[model samples]
Target: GDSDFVVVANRLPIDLWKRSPGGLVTALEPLLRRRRGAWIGWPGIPDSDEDPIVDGDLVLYPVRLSADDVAQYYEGFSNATLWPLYHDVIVKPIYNRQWWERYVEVNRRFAEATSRAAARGATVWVQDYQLQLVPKMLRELRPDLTIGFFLHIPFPPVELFMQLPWRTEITDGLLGADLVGFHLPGGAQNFLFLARRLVGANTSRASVGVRSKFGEVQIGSRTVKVGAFPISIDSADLDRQARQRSIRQRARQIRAELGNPRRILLGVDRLDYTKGIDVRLQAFAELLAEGRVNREDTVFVQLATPSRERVEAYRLLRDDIERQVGHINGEYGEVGHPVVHYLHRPVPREELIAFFVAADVMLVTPLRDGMNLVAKEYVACRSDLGGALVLSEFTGAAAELGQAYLVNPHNLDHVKDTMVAALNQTPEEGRRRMRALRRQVLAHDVDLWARSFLDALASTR
Candidate 1:
């Protein structure tokens, strides 16, 4: 019934950012150019009366949810409840029965749509937390269809996960899939632990396939694959872009424009509490204040594009980080130069590449992340890994990027010391880390991930 395709979270890979007269086309425009990508989501709109519209190769699946549904299903239940519950809960998690109801409803809609779109006996791979229930729901809808799921976020430890009110249902929902994937081996193990404890599934922690790198977690009759499949940017793809004359010329202009700063540290992330933008700014300010890093010689430029703007938590984070950036600059800026450069705006792909090339040190310290793609992007954009990466140990990417200067983003001292060390790292040492990191990222691109999963799916039959 359907052609071979890949389903991604959010809308079609292409999102139209209406800024100027022509509107700024995002990274997805280039990315979705080739693949048989079946992008599905709510189209960034809440409760549109019209059905999903498909144009050319793009097949859109529009699910309607009210403003209240957005509050409870997305911002409240998913973000407030499961997000905290899944990430070891740095803060209090609210348990709301109504939010859970809305989440179940929204997830059911996604499952029904996927079932309709998938070919008879087609392998449907659902992505991310927004659609965790889709696997089982799809199974119930079309038992003949092969379904798999991957949680792109950190799967929390048992103590954190068991705190949820509906743990059993969550486990059962994912168990509907023939295979479940996580970004880290640890995350996979945590999820398997839930299956054993909550769903009474028989699984032992050990190697899954004859494959040495991947671990196994058996559930019921099927073997749910467990391993670290680190997400990455295509180096050849990025290098192809970086090599283009336009990108090179822009990179040169960017370096000239910055002009000063003995070293420039770059960080780009979505404006979420988990990204730890406030903590990073605090550490940078302290470094400048104590004269640990010379303010005039060093600049930390953070580009956090606005995200989840409608959510209360997201709004509060903006206020919190905005004040911190201002305070840091007020205390540390001299004459016209600022120690911190904060840009709360989304940037184009070309400009992003230019900025990545210009920076001397890349600081990607997330409190917790599935796989920090920006860290990999930084490595890929580097013509020769001239910059040092200060990575967060909590990210799934850290498992693959073993050579990076991994730091616990939570520790203020750790972040400060590592940032200083990264800037001062010998060229050879930086290159060594860079080479190893680049090889890993470039070796296993997103298509590689898709192929591995699909290969395993086909082999099971």
Candidate 2:
């Protein structure tokens, strides 16, 4: 196998799951098969303390982060600080000093690994905010190489961006890249504004032409190409999956098994604070309290997959959510049927697709998002446009899939109103939205996103 271009991320795409006989199965091999690049990052574990060379078709460049790095870099800065800051500040951000120090340390080490892994003059595409410092640091060591970085989360506006005490350093760290990408144009604009503030660059609007790709100014002298490459789903694959007989059958089965309510409201989300699960439960409780939604007529099923269980915040949040569910059941539930079915684990892919089809309304209310894939996935699976979606205004997907009944997730009344509006939407209106949303998803797909970013990277060289 030939290795030329390199792709680096916080975790290698391939996952190790134990087999029945005590061996391991590579869960993400399919994802790896589609890329022609080296996978260089942590293999889902904290630190090795020793960097052992693991050679493969894609050269696996290994770097170790201390326990403190995991705590401060991963949980502290990335989760506690950047996570909240980026998510429209639904909660207070923890801009801890130790977290920033470890963040810088991890980024520097990743850059050093990036320099060593790539062939001289080869492109090094760094992934996500985990190593924002790497682009600039890598460029310093291998100045001639093409380097690009993409932040996978929402890039907050000037107000929120300023809250990060090390904003200038983060901006400069990103400048080392030949190109920087965000999923949307607004994110690009924020970075451009940041460039001018930190480095005195004259950026006219958010976009700049880079021969082929667009560039945004940083320090005026160095031009970093900037553009929105909205990440998308494999629509064709989803369409195929949606067309399968088993999918339709499973949908029927789910509807039948649900028993009481023929029209089910569905929400699939990571059990994260950003997902607004707590707020959603509150809104749901209000809906129950107000008699806006009848328990016998409709049932709400929330797919709250477990996340960040180690974090104190998540643990407390989970307990609170569970308590609310119990309280609601005690108040409103009948003998065999409850108002809500809250599954705190991931459903299988086919079953998830079935739920996507079976659900009458898709309720997605992320406080702020990095292009919520669940919204797109639901839109993609709908072959007939049979369901209605009640989305949050703050979510990145809301910016793209505009035809839905958008609402302020934080406001329980708005959520309740929107939820009812979606359920009562005319079939004609729901179909129109489904068709339009599916069209949008098809136009800006995962392949297009990958191709566009890679094309931009190649153009700079």
Give the number of the best model, judged by lDDT: 2
Range of the 10 consecutive residues with the lowest summed lDDT in candidate 1 = 18-27
Task: Name the best candidate (by TM-score).
Answer: 2
Q: Residues 1-461, candidate 1, lDDT per residue (tens digit)? A: 36334363533334462222211112234334764434456666666743545655546666666888888888888888888777778656889999999989988888777765666776666778877777788788988877767788888988888888888888888878777777767777777677777877777666433112554456556666555554555666786676677887886676566656778988899888888777788888888878989876788889999888876777888998989888988898876777788899999888888888878888888888888888888888876668888888888788778888989987889889998899888999988888888888787776666556666655545
C-alpha TM-scores of all predictions: 0.89, 0.90
The C-alpha lDDT values of all candidates are 0.74, 0.77
Q: Show pairs that collide, candidate 1.
A: none
Give per-residue CA lDDT, model 2, range 50-106, as digits (tens). Answer: 353444435566678766778888888888888878877877898789899988888
Q: Residue 180, candidate 2: how far off, in angstroms?
A: 1.1
The total number of steric clashes, by the backbone 3 Å criterion, in model 2 comes to: 2
> Any runs in candidate 2 off by more than 4 Å, and if so which?
17-36, 49-57, 206-215, 218-221
